[PDB]
Amino acid sequence: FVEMVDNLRGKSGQGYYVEMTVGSPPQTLNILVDTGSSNFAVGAAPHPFLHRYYQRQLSSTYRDLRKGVYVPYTQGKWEGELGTDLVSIPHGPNVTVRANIAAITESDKFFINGSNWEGILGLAYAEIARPDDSLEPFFDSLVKQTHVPNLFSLQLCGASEVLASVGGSMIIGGIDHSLYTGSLWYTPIRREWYYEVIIVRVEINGQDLKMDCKEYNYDKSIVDSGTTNLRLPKKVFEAAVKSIKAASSTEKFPDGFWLGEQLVCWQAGTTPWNIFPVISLYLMGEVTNQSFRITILPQQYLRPVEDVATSQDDCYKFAISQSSTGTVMGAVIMEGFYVVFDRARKRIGFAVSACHVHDEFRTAAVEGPFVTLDMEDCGYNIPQTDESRSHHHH
Numbered sequence: 001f002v003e004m005v006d007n008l009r010g011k012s013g014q015g016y017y018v019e020m021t022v023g024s025p026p027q028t029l030n031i032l033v034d035t036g037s038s039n040f041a042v043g044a045a046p047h048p049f050l051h052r053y054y055q056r057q058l059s060s061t062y063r064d065l066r067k068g069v070y071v072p073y074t075q076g077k078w079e080g081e082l083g084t085d086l087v088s089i090p091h092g093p094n095v096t097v098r099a100n101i102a103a104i105t106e107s108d109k110f111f112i113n114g115s116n117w118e119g120i121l122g123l124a125y126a127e128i129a130r131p132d133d134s135l136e137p138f139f140d141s142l143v144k145q146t147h148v149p150n151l152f153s154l155q156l157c158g159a160s161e162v163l164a165s166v167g168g169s170m171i172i173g174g175i176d177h178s179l180y181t182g183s184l185w186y187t188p189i190r191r192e193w194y195y196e197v198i199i200v201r202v203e204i205n206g207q208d209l210k211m212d213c214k215e216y217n218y219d220k221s222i223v224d225s226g227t228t229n230l231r232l233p234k235k236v237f238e239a240a241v242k243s244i245k246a247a248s249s250t251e252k253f254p255d256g257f258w259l260g261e262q263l264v265c266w267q268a269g270t271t272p273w274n275i276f277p278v279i280s281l282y283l284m285g286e287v288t289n290q291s292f293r294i295t296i297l298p299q300q301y302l303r304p305v306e307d308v309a310t311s312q313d314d315c316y317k318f319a320i321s322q323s324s325t326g327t328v329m330g331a332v333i334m335e336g337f338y339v340v341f342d343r344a345r346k347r348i349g350f351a352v353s354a355c356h357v358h359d360e361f362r363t364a365a366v367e368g369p370f371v372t373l374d375m376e377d378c379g380y381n382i383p384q385t386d387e388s389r390s391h392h393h394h
């Protein structure tokens, strides 16, 4: 799928985007690739952080749905007008789809200054689409309207006045064998809403965290290309950081470092990578009682940032952070691997990425099988609110 290799770009820590065209004539837009949301939404009015926006009135193929949408999150929000229009991905399949499109008219702390993207491509399922699950996500429309297989795969490749440029591949409708090495291991998608998975075990430098495995998935664990960090539930983050601190103890970093709010530096090329441990997440296998592990290096969890005030040093940000909404396997995890979102088979595949950052001593790894007799259920059941229970699903 050569035509789709290297079709993603971005700035380190500001997301990966794909170029898309919307309307007739086609309006070129850079769109955030987000497996953690399900709406196709685009800046549609001026904003200080946008180099352009979607102009609905200028598309001959635009159809107004005469319905607005309000999308609040913890860290930001967007609102807009719903409609449909012709959509294509120039470095994607040779097809045009009529998809739903939310024209963003108002937002707060959503767009990022310098990110070079003006919209979002929510690749997750209809269950989490706003306003409700009847608003068909883009990927669902693409599959229904064309002969494109119900699968996509992501190879996110990790990195003085600007942030480092990043690259990647979104292979729509297939798996490209040049993007990975070794075996491709699959973990079941628990439920089709977010790309929800189950973590059965966590090790830091081969050492088991020894927590009740439901703690790893409290309240869920998701694969999210739209999130930079590896985000872990409070108790898990504490145990993990305690362990990384102990292995790296010859270096006494400020508190701000471990909170992910401060860079730590070393003379160029002298970074002591070997004092930092590998992190292994064991994911539920397709077979009962089996698991496989995905192992990341500090090259994935220590994000490179070039200091204006310290240009001659290699500086890093700690990219593991606390969560109150479960585990989020963001770019920190994804950059080590080629990830296959096999929707047709309700499973997620992981293989060692041909582009992952490593050294001469260690590599990111995907290894299995690991067996457990009479394996306990590691899944958490989210308390059901009266509001969600009341929803009908016709």
Ligand SMILES: CC(C)Oc1cccc(CN2CC[C@@]3(C[C@@H]2C)CN(C)S(=O)(=O)N3c2cccc(F)c2)c1
Binding pocket: 013, 014, 015, 016, 034, 036, 037, 073, 074, 075, 076, 077, 078, 109, 110, 111, 112, 120, 226, 227, 228, 325
């Ligand atoms: C590329 C990254 C760096 O920035 C992003 C900017 C916009 C959307 C996304 C994708 N994605 C990231 C996580 C998300 C939901 C959002 C769609 C869920 N979380 C619970 S959240 O509230 O943090 N939240 C978030 C983060 C920033 C702004 C916002 F409104 C919500 C990422």
Ligand SMILES: [Zn+2]
Binding pocket: 392, 393, 394
């Ligand atoms: Zn009903």
